[PDB]
Each structure stands twice: as structure tokens, then as C-alpha cells.
Enzyme design. Structure first.
Site, short mmCIF file in Angstrom:
data_model
loop_
_atom_site.label_atom_id
_atom_site.label_comp_id
_atom_site.label_asym_id
_atom_site.label_seq_id
_atom_site.Cartn_x
_atom_site.Cartn_y
_atom_site.Cartn_z
N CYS A 122 -56.69 27.37 91.76
CA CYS A 122 -57.41 26.07 91.88
C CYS A 122 -57.46 25.65 93.35
CB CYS A 122 -56.77 25.00 91.01
SG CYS A 122 -57.86 23.60 90.68
N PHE A 123 -58.17 26.41 94.16
CA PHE A 123 -58.37 26.09 95.58
C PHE A 123 -59.58 25.17 95.71
CE2 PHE A 123 -55.62 28.01 98.72
CZ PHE A 123 -55.94 27.27 99.81
#
Ligand code: CA
Ligand code: CA
Lengths: 105, 105
Positions: B79-80
Site C-alpha cells: 500500500c504505497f
């Protein structure tokens, strides 16, 4: 919402660093945001107006330079994914290392 | 699960390109994965074993070189987030452009 914690964990790309004029201007603006603007900023950059557990220092955020001065607006990607892959010495090794990583966690 | 669509949309960093020996080895391995291994690969790299809507070509995935040959395993971030920020000519302009982006979408 702790934007100092977000500033401390932010990463940079495209030529920016924490010392870039543009980035120092950016954090002055964000620290001066109203709470409403802070919520809209999180919605734009993360897809939600709420901090994660552990607060904003637990976010993964990159600010990347994508051009010089322009009339165009900033853009975002809210759900980027990254595989960090060492340059193993053989195909056989890469297969063993990758399979071990995905199978045992 | 269309891993050709994922291969076609993947981006690279840290020195890799689609022509890197390591990357060509990587896609040979992934295309040879069993369906079980393909699901574990998606869980490791995305946090789920399911394709998004539009299939795997709609994923945002970066493969980044994070070192030379090693015994250490690959790692991931599932989850960048990324803010794409042009280098506007003034603080005033950066504020107007950023506020316009977060307020009108
Ligand atoms: Ca308020
Ligand atoms: Ca099967």
C-alpha cells in the site's frame, strides 16, 4: 492528525530530497493547512481522510518530481505496490528466494 | 489471472528495466508458476490473492532493485502512495495548484 510524523516518514523521487526548495515550500503549506484542507489532502493522496493505525507516521508516501513549472495540477496514485528484489546471481536462486518469501509469510 | 497483462503494466526502479537479465528471469519464473504460487505472489505483493476489477493490468506494481546478490529474501510494500508534484516556480503557485487538485476532485 500529526503531519510532522508524516513529514518525518515521507520519501522522495524524481530529483526531490527533504532539502529541495519545492519540498520545503510544500511542508510550509501543508503545516499551514486548515483541518478541512488536511483531510482533503489525505483523501487525494491516500484515498481516505482518516489516519491509519499508528497515525500518519505509519503511511508510506513518496513525493516525486514529474516535471518543471507548469499550469498542470499535481496527480496521485493512492494504492501503489512495490516488490523489492535483489539482483540474485542466477535464475535458480531468484526462484528459490522468491518462492521462500511468498510461501513462508 | 492474466500475468501477461501484469507484466505489460509493471514499472521498474533501482536500475532495473524490462530488458534487465534479472527481470527477464523473473517473468519466466512467474509465467511458470502454478495457480497456487500465482495467488501467493499476489498476496505477498498486493495484500490480496484476487485480481482487481479490470484484471491484473489495472494493478500499479513497481519492481525495484534493492541490492546485489544476497541470501536475504525479497520484500514488499502492499500500500504505497505517491504524490506526483511538478516543480512550480513559486510557493504561491504550488499552494494554488495543490489546493485546486485536492479540492476539485
Ligand atoms: Ca475545521
Ligand atoms: Ca491449483
Amino acid at each position: 492528525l500529526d503531519f510532522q510524523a508524516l513529514e518525518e516518514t515521507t520519501e522522495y523521487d524524481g530529483g526531490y530530497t527533504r532539502d529541495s526548495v519545492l519540498i520545503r515550500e510544500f511542508w510550509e503549506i501543508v503545516h499551514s493547512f486548515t483541518d478541512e484542507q488536511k483531510r482533503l489532502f489525505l483523501q487525494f493522496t491516500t484515498g481516505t481522510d482518516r489516519a491509519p493505525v499508528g497515525g500518519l507516521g505509519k503511511l508510506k508516501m513518496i513525493i516525486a518530481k514529474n516535471g518543471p513549472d507548469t499550469e498542470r495540477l499535481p496527480t496521485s496514485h493512492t494504492c501503489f505496490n512495490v516488490l523489492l528484489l535483489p539482483e540474485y546471481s542466477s535464475k535458480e536462486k531468484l526462484k528459490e528466494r522468491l518462492l521462500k518469501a511468498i510461501t513462508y509469510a
